[PDB]
């Protein structure tokens, strides 16, 4: 098992940050990649063994450090935007087959300025009678306005039991104002249960957006509270025909 | 032509087709290793391939080494919706004993197989808590592509993708929403967009 945090981050450009990866196996090599559309993963760094450290492909703006062969740590020390990026920390198997372990992706946004940074808004629309009538089945439409960055994940939960059946997500969220720079972001979900299901008002329908927003270390001067890392809900009951 | 060529990039398949994906070179490779990776997941190793023209099978996966060392493909047999997901072929290529080069992928998308398409836009009605009308256009052929856009008030969404542990009510949908008065769906949903023969019920 390879261990990266965070798994989210958000930092204004220039200001220094360090991304930590550790592992339990003993393993000798480490290096870390950047995953961006239409560059596959490239290599920023790799470490073949403790105190020994070199570039990889995509250096530029990154540091390490290999004092320990546990510990990989990743140092922007000026976040410039085009750092913004989904980094994975590799360690080499030491078997007869010599793949890679990787940890579970730091999502990295840098932002001109943290006043950026908006939670979502969440909004439920209930099933159309007209589609009870035509299908014997009921769509609950989810909608999530106004975030940025774009870090959410949307669940579904009915009588308090996230749901996987029924439930169809858009791919990627769309950018709200995309003549601009710092567009916030819009993503829908459907969830689709039997018309009886919907029917029935002892059932409890939750749309959950997580959102991955500023941490503690944070400074925040803004009148409107803090974007911090919190869940935007939007439910429905059941309604009886 | 790049080390590792993978293809195809994108695949979108319908849950029970067969498929096929393919990883070329024009190196010869002591072994290859396949990758998944699901959102918000690092990369999971699946096999690694040694011996010349080898077959290995991961359940409904089936990986072959071609005699050259120089391929691989990835068949999976009745794709399912937890098949969904990014599909990378590495190696040690270009002088490297320690360093993995990674094909750029297949991104695979399994989508519902719909028997009898039923393409309709549902008028929903307003939420309490928001300003806009949105149509939910629903019950189209996997066949059917519905792109994102934002034209002036009315945003379109991309059509969705099956939640990959989706067991029932598997079916496609894309919304569109508009916060101006006296919004029509039709206005979204036109003739550029969705099948001529769509179901518009009044509400
Ligand atoms: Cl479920
Ligand atoms: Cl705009
Ligand atoms: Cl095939
Ligand atoms: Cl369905």
């Known amino acids: 098992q390879v261990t990266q945090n965070p798994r989210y981050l958000i930092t204004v450009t220039g200001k220094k940050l360090t991304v930590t990866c550790s592992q339990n196996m003993n393993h000798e090599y480490m290096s870390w990649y950047r995953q961006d559309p239409g560059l596959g993963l490239r290599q920023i760094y790799y470490?073949?063994?403790?105190?020994?450290?070199d570039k990889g492909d995509v250096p530029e703006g990154y540091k390490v450090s290999r004092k320990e062969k546990r510990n990989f740590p990743l140092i922007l020390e000026s976040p410039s935007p085009n750092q913004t990026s989904l980094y994975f920390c590799?360690?080499?198997?030491?078997?007869?087959?010599?793949?890679?372990?990787f940890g579970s992706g730091t999502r990295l946004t840098v932002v001109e300025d943290l006043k950026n940074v908006f939670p979502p808004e969440v909004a439920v629309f209930e099933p159309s009678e007209a589609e009870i009538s035509h299908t014997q089945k009921a769509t609950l439409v989810c909608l999530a306005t106004g975030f940025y960055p774009d870090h959410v994940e949307l669940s579904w939960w009915v009588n308090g039991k996230e749901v996987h059946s029924g439930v169809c997500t858009d791919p990627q969220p769309l950018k709200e104002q995309p003549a601009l720079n710092d567009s916030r972001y819009a993503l829908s979900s459907r969830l689709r249960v039997s018309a009886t299901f919907w029917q029935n008002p002892r059932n409890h329908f939750r749309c959950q957006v997580q959102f991955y927003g500023l941490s503690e270390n944070d400074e925040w001067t803004q009148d409107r509270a803090k974007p911090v890392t919190q869940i935007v809900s939007a439910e429905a009951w059941g309604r009886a025909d | 032509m790049q080390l590792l060529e993978q293809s195809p990039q994108f695949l979108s398949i319908q849950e029970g087709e067969n498929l096929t994906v393919y990883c070329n070179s024009s190196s010869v490779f002591s072994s290859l290793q396949w990758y998944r990776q699901e959102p918000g997941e690092g990369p999971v190793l699946l096999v690694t391939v040694v011996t010349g023209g080898e077959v290995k099978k991961l359940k409904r996966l089936t990986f072959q080494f071609g005699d050259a060392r120089k391929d691989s493909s990835l068949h999976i047999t009745a794709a399912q919706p937890g098949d969904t997901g990014l599909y990378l072929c590495?190696?040690?290529?270009?002088?490297?004993?320690?360093?993995?080069?990674f094909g750029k992928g297949t991104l695979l998308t399994v989508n519902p197989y719909i028997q009898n398409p039923d393409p309709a836009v549902y008028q929903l009605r307003d939420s309490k808590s928001s300003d806009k009308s949105v149509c939910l256009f629903t019950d189209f052929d996997s066949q059917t592509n519905v792109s994102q856009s934002k034209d002036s008030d009315v945003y379109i969404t991309d059509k969705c993708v099956l939640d990959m542990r989706s067991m029932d009510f598997k079916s496609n949908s894309a919304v569109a929403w508009s916060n101006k008065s006296d919004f029509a769906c039709a206005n979204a949903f036109n003739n550029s967009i969705i099948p001529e023969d769509t179901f518009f019920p009044s509400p």
């Open positions: 590495a190696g040690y290529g270009g002088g490297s004993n320690y360093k993995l080069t």
């Open positions: 590799a360690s080499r198997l030491t078997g007869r087959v010599h793949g890679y372990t």
């Open positions: 470490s073949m063994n403790v105190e020994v450290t």
